[PDB]
Amino acid sequence: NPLFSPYKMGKFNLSHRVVLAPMTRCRALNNIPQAALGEYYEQRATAGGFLITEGTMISPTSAGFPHVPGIFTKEQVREWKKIVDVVHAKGAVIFCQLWHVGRASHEVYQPAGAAPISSTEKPISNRWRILMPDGTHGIYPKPRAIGTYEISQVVEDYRRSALNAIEAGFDGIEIHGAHGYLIDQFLKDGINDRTDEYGGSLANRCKFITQVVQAVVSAIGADRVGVRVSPAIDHLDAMDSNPLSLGLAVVERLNKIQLHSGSKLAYLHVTQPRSEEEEARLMRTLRNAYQGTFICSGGYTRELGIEAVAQGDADLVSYGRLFISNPDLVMRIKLNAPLNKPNRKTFYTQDPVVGYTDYPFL
Ligand SMILES: Cc1cc2nc3c(=O)[nH]c(=O)nc-3n(C[C@H](O)[C@H](O)[C@H](O)COP(=O)(O)O)c2cc1C
Ligand SMILES: [Cl-]
C-alpha cells in the first residue's frame, strides 16, 4: 500500500501519507483552544502521522466563524501548548493553519462591530450566507478595502502568529490561501478589482501571498511553512478567469522564494473541486511545476488516495470529512476496514463531545 510508505517532509520523517486536513469545528469557545480540541486531535494522532489544525485566527479581525481558536494572544498560546503536547506524545507532527477570512465575516464577529477588511469594497453576493453564533444564517456585509500600510500590518499579524505557533510547540504552520478568504480575495481576478500595485496583472495579484509567505519563512524557516491554495474552487464568489494560469503563477512565486532562501517549503497543499479529467490535469500540472512536496485534498477516498500516490500525482493525501467520523482513519485505511459516516449537523456545533469526540474506534 503506497499510502504506507514513509515520506520525508523536509526534516519531518512521516511513516505514512494519510494527512488530517484542516477543519473548522467551532469547539474553541470564545477563541480559546479548549481541552476538547486536545482530546479530538489526540484521537486522530498516529506515530509519524501529519495533522493540520482547523483554521486559526491571526488577529482580532480575522474571524468569520464562531468559537474558532486564535493564536495571537499569549493566553491562546498557553492553551495550544497543552494540545500540542498530547499530540507529540503520540508521535505525530502537527502544523497550525493560520487563517484570515477577509470579507467573509459579519459585524457580530468584528471588534466594535466594524466592517470586515478585504482587497476591495465588493461584498460576497446574496448567493452565500454566513453562519451566525445562534445557529442561523446572516448576510455578508460590504467590506472595507485596505491600503498598502494596512496590508503590511496584516503581514505582520501572520509573522507574529507564526512565531507564536512555534512558541506553543507546533512543528510548523500552514498559510490558508484558499476558498475565497483574505489571500484568495487578492489572488482571484473575480474579486480583486484594485488598480494599485496589488491589483490587475498576475504579478500584482500574487504580491500579497508572496509577502505573507516571505514573512513567515524569514521568521520560522521555510521547512516549517506549508502553503494552501485553491485556484479552481469558486466558494464565496471567488472565481478567476484562468485558474490554471493563476495557479501556475503562484507556484512560480513559491519556487522563487525557495531559491532565494536556499531551502524548500514544507509543502504545497491544493484542494480540488469535484470535468473530472480537466481538474485532474490541473492538479498534476501544479504538482509538476512545483519544486517540492505536494498534498492533494478534496473528495479523496481510500482508493483515490492510493492511486494518487502510486501514479506520482501527490506525495501526501489529506482527508477531511472521513477524518471527522473516523478517529482511527489511518488504521481503517491501512486495514481496508469499514468507515463511519459523518453527521453534517454537528460539524460546526459547540458541544465538546457530541459529534466531535464520540465517533467510535474500530
Ligand atoms: C467542516 C469542515 C471544515 C473545514 N474547515 C477548513 C478550514 O478551516 N481550513 C481549510 O483550509 N479547509 C477547511 N475545510 C476543507 C478541508 O480541509 C478539506 O480540504 C476537505 O474536507 C477535503 O475533502 P473531503 O472532506 O472530501 O476529504 C473544511 C472542511 C469541512 C468539511
Ligand atoms: Cl476553508
Residue numbers in the entry: 10 to 283, 297 to 384
The authors write:
Jasmonates are phytohormones that are pivotal in mediating plant responses to various biotic and abiotic stresses and regulating plant growth. The first crystal structure of OPR3 from tomato (SlOPR3) showed that the enzyme crystallized as a self-inhibitory dimer in which the L6 loop, a critical loop involved in substrate recognition and coenzyme binding, from each protomer intrudes into the active site cavity of the other protomer. Based on these observations, it was postulated that the formation of the self-inhibitory homodimer represents a mechanism for regulating OPR3 activity and, thereby, jasmonic acid biosynthesis.
